[PDB]
Structure formats: structure tokens, C-alpha cells
């Protein structure tokens with residue numbers, strides 16, 4: 001009661017939000033790359049410097065940002081992905097909070113450069129000050145968007161303390177990129193670190209062979225044990241791969257990539273199902289190696305549980321679990 | 334790009350926020366009760382109806398809310414607990430986002446009734462509409478604050494679906510109240526369900542005996558095996574109780590309450606430390622029963638990681654772990 005109930009300053013309120021969604025450089029990358037995916041992007045180039053604590057440049061060939069919408073794009077609670085409660089209960093895109101851009105820009109130097117197909121001129125935008133004021137200016141840029149985030153946490157001393165080493169932090173970026181490359185085989189992704197190309201995942205065309213990118217990501221060992229899954233029931237569909245438990249090593253058990261409607265996710269439920277399927281098949285229980293994709297009606301899953309979409313809750317919980325269990329158990333036989 | 338980048342409506346933006354912090358009735362209770370604690374409250378009465386899906390009434394004898402600050406209290410990003418980045422990096426209260434009240438009021442009928450010691454008159458306030466407009470009016474109320482949340486999720490059909498049974502949901506409230514009663518022995522707390530008193534934890538006076546409330550909460554079995562801990566090193570202090578691993582049952586292992594600066598918390602780090610201490614002491618590894626309290630300089634711990642403060646990150650990670658490990662290991666010998 002000594003201090004008055006007061007509205008938080010624009011920038012500080014955003015940093016608090018940034019703390020719950022922007023953990024480290026890998027997190028900045030996840031969000032910006034997911035924006036590119038939503039923008040219809042087909043080629044995404046990521047350039048990192050000093051593990052991303054120095055620079056994070058993400059360029060995409062997505063639809064781009066309108067000039068008169070550059071500022072809105074950097075505003076809080078501003079999004080083009082949903083406009084009602086209905087749209088929310090049926091999320092069909094990675095983003096929907098309209099919080100990512102303003103959050104990251106409040107703890108770094110974020111520059112947004114974009115051009116839509118209907119524009120001859122390209123534009124650049126960024127927020128500054130205690131109030132996060134936006135300024136828009138000319139710039140040369142092809143159709144699409146380039147995000148440039150510099151000096152992550154340069155203005156949040158405390159959080160900068162938690163940054164690991166260049167190598168470690170970049171390693172996390174690499175793993176996140178790896179996860180996204182597996183969610184969208186149809187998307188070409190290039191990753192560079194300190195001027196050198198670390199990796200490049202070329203797109204897998206219509207009905208093309210996925211195994212190729214699969215092996216390039218998870219390794220050849222995994223590809224040899226990988227058992228393709230195709231299990232469906234109405235609006236529940238399980239696809240992807242599961243390696244034979246009898247032939248899974250601790251090294252392979254590192255590959256436990258799971259997706260819900262194309263969104264990377266680590267859900268205790270799904271994981272429990274897949275494992276039970278391997279415990280009841282094989283003799284003992286152990287860590288399985290997999291890359292499963294669960295497609296489901298967006299009304300049966302709630303993704304508004306974590307500010308970073310790290311968790312989900314299935315309405316019909318038991319059903320979903322039994323579904324994945326059978327699916328996996330079906331292939332192990 | 335078809336839909337324009339647009340700012341979300343007041344109410345919908347809050348519901349999205351509510352989804353990340355207000356899981357179920359127990360969550361509403363946690364937040365409101367934590368507000369009472371911050372308000373200097375010494376007696377907190379909680380009344381629940383139909384597992385809290387019908388009504389959640391929390392009355393406290395805290396300092397209360399100023400009349401001209403009732404609206405601010407219900408606004409977004411509005412708080413009296415912090416006003417700068419400095420205040421944040423050194424959190425000394427349960428709340429600091431200024432998001433709890435508006436979030437819950439956007440998914441229920443929340444009525445705030447309060448009076449400060451300097452006011453003769455009491456007031457009542459609540460938000461309504463797509464824009465969350467506040468209205469303030471007369472009301473009779475002693476010094477303090479009463480929160481009344483009705484029809485949780487009445488306007489969010491999807492989330493209402495996830496509510497368990499009356500008994501289950503109330504069971505979660507009971508467990509949360511149990512956790513808070515353990516964090517503040519000096520606070521009298523009364524809990525009722527459907528007009529009947531379920532529990533009442535009376536305050537433990539200055540230096541009084543805690544064991545009494547300890548046994549009333551965790552049970553007598555735990556109290557018999559409980560080993561008091563008192564381990565300090567500078568600004569790191571570990572207090573509380575740990576039962577002998579050799580005499581811990583699966584029933585007792587249900588008691589694994591941990592606190593950081595008086596804030597209930599379940600951290601994998603701390604848990605790992607306590608267990609390692611029991612694995613290296615006893616023969617095998619297993620679930621330990623405990624009620625530990627970790628006090629530490631607010632600059633060594635970051636609590637701005639989860640919108641509901643469900644997680645933390647220690648700056649000097651290894652040190653903290655070794656500290657709790659020794660502390661526990663010290664008592665087991």
C-alpha cells in the first residue's frame with residue numbers, strides 16, 4: 001500500500017513478458033522462424049553471430065509485412081493470425097498472442113525490414129525508448145521479411161548473466177532449427193554461424209522422398225532402425241517414425257521429436273504412450289527414439305497453456321493416449 | 334496477410350493471458366490468496382462452492398485497496414509491487430506482473446470489495462464488456478479485501494470442458510491451500526466447501542511450536558520421521574524437514590513441498606539435490622518426503638520465467654545444488 005497501484009512502463013512490461021517467452025537466443029530463433037513459416041515462407045536463411053548473443057538474422061521469402069502495418073507488427077497484443085475467441089479455440093498457425101515481436105525488441109535491438117508483393121518500395125522498422133516508439137524508414141528488400149536482433153539482453157543485465165558459451169547457445173539454436181526442419185520437410189532452411197554455413201536442409205518436393213532429409217537431420221543410424229507409422233481414426237492421425245526398442249541406443253534415444261498439428265512439442269502424455277508401447281512390446285522399459293507427427297482437430301487440443309506453446313492439453317485425454325499407443329504398438333508388430 | 338495485423342480486444346487478450354496463468358479453480362485461489370499475503374494479511378478465509386466452478390470467495394484482513402485505485406487494480410500490467418527493472422531483479426513479493434486480476438476477471442465474474450484503514454466507506458469494483466470497463470460503487474466492508482469470482486469460464490466454453498469433478502477440482506484447491514499454509518505458519522487460514530468448514534490452520538505465534546501445524550497439514554506419520562534442517566552459508570539458508578529415506582513410504586513421498594523465498598516451487602534442481610542426498614545416504618534411490626525452505630538473495634534467483642511463477646533459474650546453479658545436498662546430507666548424519 002505504500003507504493004501506488006500503477007501501470008507498468010511499456011518497455012518494462014514487455015521485458016517481463018520476454019522473460020516468460022524469450023529464454024535464450026534459441027528462443028528468439030524459434031519465434032522469428034515460426035513467424036516466417038506462418039508468412040508462407042519456403043526458404044529461410046538464418047545467420048547467427050557469437051552464439052546469437054551478438055546477432056540473429058532471419059530472412060524469409062514469406063508474404064511480407066505491409067508498410068502501414070510495420071508498427072502494428074511490433075505492438076503488443078497485435079496479431080494478424082486471430083481476431084476472436086473462435087479463431088483461438090481453433091488455432092491454425094504457430095502464432096496467436098501478438099506478443100513475440102514487442103517482447104524480443106524490448107530486450108534487444110530488433111530491426112524489421114519487409115516488402116509485400118504489392119509494394120515497389122521496401123521498409124525498415126524498430127521500437128525504441130521507455131515507451132517503445134516505432135520509427136519507419138526506407139530500405140532495399142525483396143519480397144519477404146528480414147529480422148535482425150542484436151545485443152540480446154544488452155539492457156537486462158540480470159538475464160544476460162544466464163547466457164552459456166557461444167558454442168553452447170549456438171548448439172541450442174542448431175537443435176531448435178533441427179526440430180523445425182523436421183516439422184516442415186517442404187521448407188528449405190539454411191543455418192550459418194560466424195560467416196560459415198553450418199547446415200542447409202533443402203526442400204522435399206511433392207510426395208518426394210523424406211527419408212533423405214530425415215537421415216540428414218537425425219543421422220543415418222536412426223534411419224536404419226526407423227519404422228514408418230501410418231495410423232488413422234477419424235480426425236486423429238499419427239505419422240512419422242519409431243525405431244525398434246530392441247535396437248535403440250542411448251545415443252538414438254536423444255531423437256525424441258514430437259509434433260502436434262505441425263507444432264514441435266514435448267508432451268508427457270504422448271511420450272508415455274510411445275514408451276508404454278515399447279515397454280509392452282520389448283522386454284524392459286527404456287527411452288525410445290522417434291519422430292512422430294500427431295494431426296488432430298484444433299478443437300480437441302488447447303495450445304493456450306504456455307506463453308511459448310511448450311505444452312498442450314487434450315480434451316479427450318485418454319482417447320488420444322490410447323490412439324498413439326495402438327499406432328506405435330501396431331508398427332512394432 | 335489476408336487478415337490485417339490488428340490489436341486484440343481487451344477481453345480476448347486477457348483470456349489468452351488467463352489461459353497461461355489461470356488453469357483451474359485452484360489457480361484462481363493461489364493468485365488471489367497470494368495477493369492477500371502481499372497485502373500483509375494475517376487471516377484469510379476461503380469459501381468455495383461446487384469445487385470453485387460456482388464460487389470462489391477469498392476474504393483477507395490485509396491493508397486493503399484505495400478507492401481511487403480499485404480500477405487500476407483490475408487493469409492490465411498494473412501493479413503496486415514493482416515500478417522498475419531494479420524492483421524486478423529483486424522481487425520481494427509474490428506478485429509483480431500486474432496481470433492476475435484482469436486475467437481472472439476476463440474469464441469469470443470477479444467482484445473486488447475493499448477498504449483501507451484511512452477510509453470510512455468501503456467500495457466494490459468489477460470489469461465488464463469487450464473492453465473490460467470498470468464500475469465502482471458503495472459497499473459495506475471492514476478493513477481489508479474480499480474477492481468473489483463466480484462462473485469460472487462461463488464465457489470460455491472450450492476451457493470449461495477441462496474442469497474435472499466438484500470433488501477433484503476442490504481437492505486441488507485443498508492441496509494448494511495446504512502448500513500456502515506451510516509457507517506462512519504465521520498466517521491463519523480457513524477453508525470451507527459448500528457451507529461446511531473443511532479446514533482451519535491457526536497461526537503459530539512468535540517462535541511458537543511449528544510441529545503442531547506441520548503435523549496438522551502433512552499428517553502425524555510425517556511428523557514422526559521428520560528431521561529438522563538448519564544449514565546456512567552466507568545468504569543461502571536451508572530450513573524445514575526431511576524424513577529418513579529408510580522410513581519413507583510412497584504415501585509420505587507425496588509430501589514433497591519446496592519453497593524459494595517463501596514461494597511454493599517445484600524445481601527439478603532442488604529435487605535432484607534432496608534425492609541425491611538420500612540415494613547416497615540410504616542404499617537405493619527413491620522418492621523422499623520433505624518440506625524444505627530455501628532462502629536466498631533475490632539477485633541469485635530469477636522468478637520471471639513462467640507467468641504463474643511455477644519455475645525458477647538459479648544464477649549460480651551448481652553452488653545452490655551442492656548447498657541443499659550437503660544440508661540434507663548433513664542431517665541424514
Ligand SMILES: Nc1ncnc2c1ncn2[C@@H]1O[C@H](COP(=O)(O)OP(=O)(O)NP(=O)(O)O)[C@@H](O)[C@H]1O
Nearest residue numbers: 035039064073079080095096097098099100101145
Ligand atoms: N516474417 C514475417 N513475415 C510476414 N509477417 C510477419 C513476420 N513476422 C511477423 N509478422 C506479422 O507480424 C505479426 C506478429 O508478430 P508477433 O509479435 O510474432 O505475433 P504473432 O505471430 O501474432 N503471435 P505470437 O507469436 O503468439 O506472439 C503477425 O501477426 C504477422 O502478421
Ligand SMILES: Nc1ncnc2c1ncn2[C@@H]1O[C@H](COP(=O)(O)OP(=O)(O)NP(=O)(O)O)[C@@H](O)[C@H]1O
Nearest residue numbers: 368372397406412413428429430431432433434478
Ligand atoms: N487482497 C488484496 N489486498 C490489497 N491489495 C490487493 C489485493 N489483491 C490485489 N491487490 C492490489 O492490486 C494490485 C494487483 O493485482 P494483480 O492483478 O494480482 O497483480 P500483482 O499482484 O501486481 N502481480 P501478478 O500477480 O504477478 O499479476 C496489486 O499490485 C495490489 O496493489
Ligand SMILES: [Mg+2]
Nearest residue numbers: 031035095100
Ligand atoms: Mg509470432
Ligand SMILES: [Mg+2]
Nearest residue numbers: 364368428433
Ligand atoms: Mg497478484
Ligand code: NA
Nearest residue numbers: 073075078098
Ligand atoms: Na505483435
Ligand code: NA
Nearest residue numbers: 406408411431
Ligand atoms: Na492488475
